[PDB]
Each structure stands twice: as C-alpha cells, then as structure tokens.
Amino acid sequence: SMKYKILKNLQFYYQENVIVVQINEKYLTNREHIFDVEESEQYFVDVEEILTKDGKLEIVYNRPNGYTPLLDLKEYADFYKLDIVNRLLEMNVLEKTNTYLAMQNILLKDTRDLLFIYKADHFDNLPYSTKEELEQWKNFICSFFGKFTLEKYEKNRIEVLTKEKNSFLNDVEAVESLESLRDLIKNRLTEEQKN
Numbered sequence: 001s002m003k004y005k006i007l008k009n010l011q012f013y014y015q016e017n018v019i020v021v022q023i024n025e026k027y028l029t030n031r032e033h034i035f036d037v038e039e040s041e042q043y044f045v046d047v048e049e050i051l052t053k054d055g056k057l058e059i060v061y062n063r064p065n066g067y068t069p070l071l072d073l074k075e076y077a078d079f080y081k082l083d084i085v086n087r088l089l090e091m092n093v094l095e096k097t098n099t100y101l102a103m104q105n106i107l108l109k110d111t112r113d114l115l116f117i118y119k120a121d122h123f124d125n126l127p128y129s130t131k132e133e134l135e136q137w138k139n140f141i142c143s144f145f146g147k148f149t150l151e152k153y154e155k156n157r158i159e160v161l162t163k164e165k166n167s168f169l170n171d172v173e174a175v176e177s178l179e180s181l182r183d184l185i186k187n188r189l190t191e192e193q194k195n
Contacts, residue, residue: 001072002014002071006104007105009024009127010104012104012105016063017063020060020061022057023057027127028057032125036125037120043114045115046062048060064115069108070106070144071103079192083189084144085141085144086189087111087112089185094136095133099118103140104117134177135157137178138173138181139154139157145168146160147166158173161173
C-alpha cells in the first residue's frame with residue numbers, strides 16, 4: 001500500500017480517512033478560484049477542507065471506505081486492468097472536468113466502482129492536463145499496462161512503444177478516435193469473458 005506518490009507538482013498522501021493533495025504555492029500564480037474545487041461532481045470524492053501550511057496548499061478529501069489507490073493494483077493481471085479501463089471510459093470524466101488521468105488520481109473499490117480525487121478550477125488557477133483527451137487516454141493506458149512512467153509516454157509515446165514491443169499498447173496507439181478506443185477496449189474485454 002503506497003501511502004505517498006508524486007504526480008507532476010502534486011504530492012498525494014493516502015491516509016486513513018482522508019486523501020491530502022499538497023501543492024507548493026510557488027506553482028500557483030492565481031488563487032482567486034481555489035475554493036471552487038469544493039463543488040461536488042459525480043465520480044469525485046468530496047473536499048473536506050482547504051488549508052495552507054508554510055507556503056503550501058493542502059486540499060483534504062474524504063476517503064470513502066474500501067477504496068484503494070489504483071497505483072497499488074498495477075501488478076494485477078491484464079484482464080483485471082482491462083475491466084477497469086472499460087469502466088473508466090464509461091465514467092467519461094475528462095469531458096467536463098479539468099483533471100489528471102493518472103493512477104495516482106484514481107481510487108478503486110471494485111473494477112466497476114472507481115472514483116477520482118483531484119480536479120482543478122475552471123479559471124486556470126490549479127494545474128491539470130491540457131492535452132487532447134485521446135492523448136491522455138493513450139498515455140494513461142500505457143502507464144497502467146506498460147513498463148514506463150506516465151511522463152515517459154507523455155514525452156514521446158511512439159518512440160517508447162516501438163522498442164517496448166507490447167502488442168496491446170501498439171493497438172491502443174493506433175486508434176484514431178475516442179470512440180474507436182472504446183470499441184477496442186470493449187472488444188478485448190469481451191474476448192477475456194469467453195473461453
């Protein structure tokens with residue numbers, strides 16, 4: 001059980017009753033809208049309090065019972081992880097949220113029951129991924145199934161994949177749209193469900 005993990009300029013602390021995301025205020029030029037993250041959103045845990053501590057912002061989130069950091073499940077079998085990806089695609093949080101699609105930012109209760117932790121405001125105060133949605137999905141899937149970190153795929157996905165020789169990830173890389181990604185994942189999941 002990993003209790004601490006860096007995601008870009010965020011530090012995540014996975015505690016007993018809460019998650020804490022810490023961001024040094026030196027990374028936050030504008031802060032007028034930081035408290036906007038208290039707004040509830042389906043599939044996101046609730047913010048309990050927003051504090052600062054010696055120049056660092058602390059966002060404290062409720063941690064509901066029975067939710068495990070997805071980081072802790074990276075060594076589960078591919079057929080288990082495929083089910084998770086299929087469910088994440090159904091949740092479709094990137095369409096209406098400024099967030100990070102990353103293992104650090106996702107909690108799992110079961111393969112069909114997942115929650116996100118951190119999201120940003122809509123006034124560019126807090127950081128998030130501005131990448132094309134399909135790119136975020138490809139990089140996330142590579143980080144969840146592959147040998148390298150999210151940041152390695154974000155920098156040059158095709159270069160890393162050419163030598164990685166992961167046939168599933170090569171198929172993920174080739175899709176042209178979000179709908180085709182959903183079809184690929186669903187088809188692979190259907191194959192795992194039969195024998």
